[PDB]
Amino acid sequence: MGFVRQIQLLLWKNWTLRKRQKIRFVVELVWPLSLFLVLIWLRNANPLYSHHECHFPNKAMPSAGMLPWLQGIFCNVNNPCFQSPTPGESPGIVSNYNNSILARVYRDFQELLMNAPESQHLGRIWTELHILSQFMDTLRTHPERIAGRGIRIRDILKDEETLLLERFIIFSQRRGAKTSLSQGTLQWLYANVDFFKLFRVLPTLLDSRSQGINLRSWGGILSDMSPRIQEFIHRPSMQDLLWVTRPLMQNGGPETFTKLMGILSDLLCGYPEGGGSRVLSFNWYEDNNYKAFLGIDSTRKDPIYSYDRRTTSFCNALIQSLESNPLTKIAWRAAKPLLMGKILYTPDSPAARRILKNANSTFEELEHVRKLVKAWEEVGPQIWYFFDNSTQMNMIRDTLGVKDFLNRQLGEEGITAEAILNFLYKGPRESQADNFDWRDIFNITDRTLRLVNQYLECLVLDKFESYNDETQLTQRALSLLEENMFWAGVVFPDMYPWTSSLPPHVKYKIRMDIDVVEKTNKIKDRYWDSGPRADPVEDFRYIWGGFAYLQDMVEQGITRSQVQAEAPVGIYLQQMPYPCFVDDSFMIILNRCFPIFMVLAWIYSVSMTVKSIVLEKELRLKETLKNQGVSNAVIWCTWFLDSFSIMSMSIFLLTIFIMHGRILHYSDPFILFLFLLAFSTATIMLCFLLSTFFSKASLAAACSGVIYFTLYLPHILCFAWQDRMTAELKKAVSLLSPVAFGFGTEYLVRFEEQGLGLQWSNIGNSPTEGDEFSFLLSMQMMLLDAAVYGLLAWYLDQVFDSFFEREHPGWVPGVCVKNLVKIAVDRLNITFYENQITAFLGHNGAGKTTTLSILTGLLPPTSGTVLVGGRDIETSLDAVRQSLGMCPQHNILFHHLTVAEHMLFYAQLKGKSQEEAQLEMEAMLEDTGLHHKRNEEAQDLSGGMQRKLSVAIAFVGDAKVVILDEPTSGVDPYSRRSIWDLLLKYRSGRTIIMSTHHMDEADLLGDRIAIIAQGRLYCSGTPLFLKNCFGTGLYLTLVRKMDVNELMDVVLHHVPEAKLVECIGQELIFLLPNKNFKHRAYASLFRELEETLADLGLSSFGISDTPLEEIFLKVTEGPQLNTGTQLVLQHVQALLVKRFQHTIRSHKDFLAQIVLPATFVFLALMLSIVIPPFGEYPALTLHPWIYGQQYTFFSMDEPGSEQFTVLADVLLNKPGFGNRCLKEGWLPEYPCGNSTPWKTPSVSPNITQLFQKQKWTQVNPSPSCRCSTREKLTMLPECPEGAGGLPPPQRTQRSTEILQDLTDRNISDFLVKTYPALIRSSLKSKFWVNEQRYGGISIGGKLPVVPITGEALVGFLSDLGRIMNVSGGPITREASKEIPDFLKHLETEDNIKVWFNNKGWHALVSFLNVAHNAILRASLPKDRSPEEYGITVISQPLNLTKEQLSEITVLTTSVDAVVAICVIFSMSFVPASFVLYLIQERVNKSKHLQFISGVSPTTYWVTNFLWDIMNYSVSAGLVVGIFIGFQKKAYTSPENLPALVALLLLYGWAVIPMMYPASFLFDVPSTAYVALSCANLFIGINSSAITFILELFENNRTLLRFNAVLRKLLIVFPHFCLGRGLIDLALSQAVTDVYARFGEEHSANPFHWDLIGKNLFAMVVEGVVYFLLTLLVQRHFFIVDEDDDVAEERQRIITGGNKTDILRLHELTKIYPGTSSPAVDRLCVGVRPGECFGLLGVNGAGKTTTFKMLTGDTTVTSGDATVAGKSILTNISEVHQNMGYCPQFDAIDELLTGREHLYLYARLRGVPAEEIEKVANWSIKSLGLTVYADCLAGTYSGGNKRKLSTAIALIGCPPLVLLDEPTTGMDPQARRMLWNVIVSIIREGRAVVLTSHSMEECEALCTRLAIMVKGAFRCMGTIQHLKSKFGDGYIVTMKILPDLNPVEQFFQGNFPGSVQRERHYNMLQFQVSSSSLARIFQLLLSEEYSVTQTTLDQVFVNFAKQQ
């Protein structure tokens, strides 16, 4: 014995078993790898996105001026990131555009031209000209001296003397007109009157009114400025300006719209490093867009065109070109509603009018610019008239500039003057000098200014219209929006049209359409994305759509209407900076596919392990191993290692794939391997538990995978409620292994995100705050579920005259028994001995099995006394079960093993090393006779060789006692002789005990016989002893040829004491008396009997002895039928009852037809009802508290200034932020509270150490955070400790929020470096994150305004205009009266800014409101208690517009396209529960039996279908009831309910016949049920989803065709019809439901050849075609010879005189297609009436094909056979009414009772209704089944089934009867009881045809035999005729002081040929041939002798002995 040596044998056996599949061995290692290859493809099809830091510029609101507003719109269109803090997020700076060339140039000009202390006297020259050319140069009419006039004058006056003066004219006048100091004096009352003007050539005397002289005051000014102007124009700023303006003025240049935009950006904007980065969005699924993912374009239909009245022609001709162009089509749809929009303000009343009038400043100042540009229309030509024909320019600077002093000045001018060019650019009019440089500048400025004026006419700038109720506003809004000219609409919901006084709390709502506003269902993203949410298009609809602008305008109007503060402040929006991140989209699908894929990859190993475990116990191969001495623990521990040695090799490759495939980058693969190992262990140890519920292999292999998969689903609904679940309950629900796998997978993903994997040091830790459930807990829960399952499985397995012949003094006894007792054994004393077989003959339950069990050591006796080879059975067991060997009734053979391993395995189990086992294997394999085919598999042997091997194994090892029972039951007679030889070669020195129920066997091989009748011995002795200790006549048979009266006298001479005991056809059995002398007489009789044989007319004469079975029994105690229409109408109503009684009392096909459909439809219907609706956008008041608990910082920049120290007070204390804690109401859901004082938090002393020791610079504050490197990519930076400086002060406001001062601190540092530390605590779920910080307000910041005031500018403009004669016109006088209010509103000086975080959708407009609401309270007078005023904003969108409802409808019907799939998959469980019954009935030949009784397959199939429809209707009605119960529309409405009922019924109508041809292709119900519910699901998923998802592509011009052909080609499937019908009934209702919203009547109806009308016709058509296909497929399945045989062959030529026959069988044969030797040759026999034929047949020669022909199974190839005139070649339906049948198998329905099981087969024949009552009772009483008459057949013993089969075969009164093994598993009493019945019908006149394996019954009741050797018949005749003619024998036996030599001496002389026989101490057995000479030669005596004859069994062995 041993343990570690038993484990080795079991493990070797399992390893050898596993290698021989080679399909399991390949799939188990390939399937997971192919499952995980897609998870690598997904990795490679989802790249990784990383980005650096982001700092964004700020956006100016309209309240901050108009120039900054427009500049911020133009610069920040793309919202760029910058990597480096912008200048706008500093304590005082707001400007952010301090780098444009237009600002550097202005700074240079303001620096070195203006602010010039050098000259500063250009004003002096201005004053000079302003005083001169007003009085002295003009002097129009004002009186003066003689020398002065308008344009020309002379001083020639005051002369009195007649006229050297020519010389004076030459000297004083020198080539110069009126436009000499002493020359006239030198030439000199001539010397008194010549000179009058004492003022000489000196130039400065013109304004001699009171006092004025200024002529030589220019020199320094016009000689010092020019070098500085040169230096200014040669500054780098002007270099950049000119180098950028080099294009945009040339030709063939600015059209690429990227050079132009680049120029404008570089000239107005000033952004560095290229411009920015434009972070993207990538979500698309937070909006349910479904076409940003699917490739479809999402663009609304372009709006209508109409030639608009009263606008312009140019603008109107521009709109069409700009709107129909394919490029600028979407960038103009986003801008049109702002430029040309319109605003509506429903409550028309004085208060609303005043508010909207105050909110009108922006458009007013934008109209002032249009007026200012239009003024050029008049200014232009007046300026032009100043340069061509002008009394100033052309007459002053063009006539001269003199010609002499001007010449001298030009010579002494600057570097280059070119006075000729100075005159060419001085008004050349009649010249046309064309290089010219003067006309082109004016020519270009006019043509570029009128174009601007022409564009500016398109804008609409009066865009407020009033109504008087909201409904008219909504109507007008949709009317305008169809044209795309709708901006928002304003509604004041708290004032009537007569309101005049504003209440001190104003509320309004902005109403826009949903394409330009964030949705009001959600306030967050459902799934947290690592990204700033800074995409200018998909993330900022509140800015590019115009919500924020209009909100600001209305807030400013409401403020200005009730304050009158006259000191404005603006608003700037600034977005919080964001750290660097890494966005991985693969962690979304890994977390969802890793557990699914892992659970799905063992779905086959689980099934193939449970199947093996269950099968090994189903074949009773486990109790055998226990009998040999193997415990249960060893079996378990070997199955474990068997299943575990493969999963290890699989995990080792899965780990390699997962690592090297980049699915996990950095994870320490050892932990991953050790993590999958625990899952494998739990899975195996769960297979062990699942193996203890099932009894069949197929059912277990089918249900195991399904149960395994089902046990994981509690994790899918456990990943939603992830936050409510406490860890204490996470540990309780984790007792299921597949959910403990997912719980660890989540932590795996969370660790992989962070840049650091598992690494052996954080598996015990968690990436959370207080979860307490780590990654170790998952592994430790799996390794505990393993043990729990193990204990549970192990536990649940256990609970479920003298009689005793005098012996010899001794021949070494081997097994003694003394006074054995147990309770049915009363003191029996048996003593088995050595080297002789003993036949333990007994009853079938009178005490044989119990004593065999006692002797075989499996149960204990009470107080008996046993012995085994000199040992006991209680004191020692481990030593006795070493030589004791046994074999049971069944077989002990492992499939997929060979003979060699069988012998070796059992030899080693008995306890023997490998060498002895391999030695004795080669010895037993010789005696067994299996030298060849020693490598053949255990299965696929002959079928008798398996029994040979089974009994050969019983002798393996050192065996002494062999207790084997029924060793040769159910085998052909030749293999029985083979096994007998085996036994006879092994009783050399070993005791053998052989229990059997056949008595033909217990004589030829048996030396002692013992009978246990009443639980005790009664008789024990050799067969001769028993045959003599009773005394019976020696049976004398006699046969005749084709006269008892004269035959009686023959034996009358030697009259005995018995006569003709029995006389059957051509037979005569005689019975003589035993003993009583009769020495000579008896011998003499066979003298005249053997002599005159022919003369008398006999043919044979035997003389056998009383059979051994005879004594055994002693020592134990049709009217006229129906036909035609009545027959058919009775067949149908009998089959209906048979199929009703089977289901009325079964539970499997009750919950397979009622419970599953309702359950699976109920779950789907609830799934359809717990999904939130799509659309339905509510109001949603906007305030910062719609988010939870949060931080809101604060900062007070620029202190000391008044009106800000009160603004910072009414923001913190007083009313607080926002509008919560008012003083009266404001929402009851959000109450008030109470506050705490300022409190700086505490820090670890190491932090306060590191800040007071090092040197931190203004540019470099507290240490920086580490960003992801090339190989370590982290979701968020690492941020070392002490990252944002010291914590700031804190409070807890009355509105329950912590605000914190950030004064005197760097904000764009604190915000960047402390954000990860907040997300790391607000995370732990990744769903609906809080972010804990959404905004804050920074008070202060001013930008520099223009110093140039108003009136001081119009003074300059007016003077410049008046000095050159322009004076403007009527447009100028109206455009210049508004200038000191226009130059004031461009820029607002002091203004605040608000920080917002875009991760919350509504956090922008929530804090803009807070800022405006604080500005209101910062300026009201000092007697109004600012805790009463406020403003609230509501954002209620506008009605959907029938184009945005199509998408809502698609998303709505998408959830009914899943209910359709579930209904299809749940209505297919009912038709698959009928194919199971059909499959079970096709096998076991129960359908063939009804066909034989005659059911004409048409009626069979029609009745089955007619019952199936009615059975299915109940489930259909139940499903309809559930649908009615849910009260859903579109199905349960009064109009659609018929459309649902007619859709569910026709589906069954169509699909039931479609699965009927699947009953022919399967043999196991479970495999069919698995393969059907998968094919139906596969078809039903793809027939109702492909067509759904292929209709969304309105383009591609080939999808709408490839779908339109599928819509008419997929209709051959009844799944598609139902799916499309159920989807159509939802789509039609949706379409007719969106219309009722607009007030319409769609009024559609089904049954219209487009909704379901075509489907309801296709189903009817294709339900009557598959039935015909079923009928067809069921139509396409259903020389040298012995003289005696030749005599019949030649006699069967004239069947005219002997046509009384009941079987002709003319000629038959069955040549197979793939064969050449026919299985049946030409044969021909007649069956006279009153005889039963044999038709024995050699095994392996072909005999069963004959019954397959006769019954009607196969085709009779070239045959001819008739029963009673009707042939079995054409007329095979009326003949079947004259033929019974008892099949070899048992065709019984195990749910019906015997009585009704007889009623069915009675009704299938005729026997009208009122007589089955007696026909049945007759059959029941005749067959002796009264107690089991009605007891649910199937509970029957196994022999009772044979009685029932015979009873249902004998029904009515058929002339001919076929029997096929009528008795197999019966005790002899039942066998005789049944044989009497078979004789009692042949004794009436009806023929019988029998076939069997036991020669005993063929010899007990028969009249003719015929043995079918390989070809055709070989012999024929009666029993005695065959015995004599084909045999010899008369086996003689004699008893004894014995001496064998004297007995052998007399047989030495005579009787030549005796092959002697078995030898014993006194028993001799010989064999004479045929002479009957012993009976007369046995006078010479010296006590017992008997002369039997060879049995009929020995004759069959003679024929089978060859071949």
Ligand SMILES: *[C@@H]1O[C@H](CO)[C@@H](O)[C@H](O)[C@H]1NC(C)=O
């Ligand atoms: C603007 O930029 C100039 C140089 O480009 C610099 O001297 C000046 O200080 C800047 N002004 C502000 C407010 O940053």
Ligand SMILES: *[C@@H]1O[C@H](CO)[C@@H](O)[C@H](O)[C@H]1NC(C)=O
């Ligand atoms: C705030 O209200 C009063 C202050 O007088 C105080 O009694 C109360 O406890 C404070 N807290 C709350 C929650 O009311």
Ligand SMILES: *[C@@H]1O[C@H](CO)[C@@H](O)[C@H](O)[C@H]1NC(C)=O
């Ligand atoms: C700060 O304080 C300790 C004290 O020496 C220092 O060694 C270490 O770097 C820091 N420890 C912690 C827990 O921050």
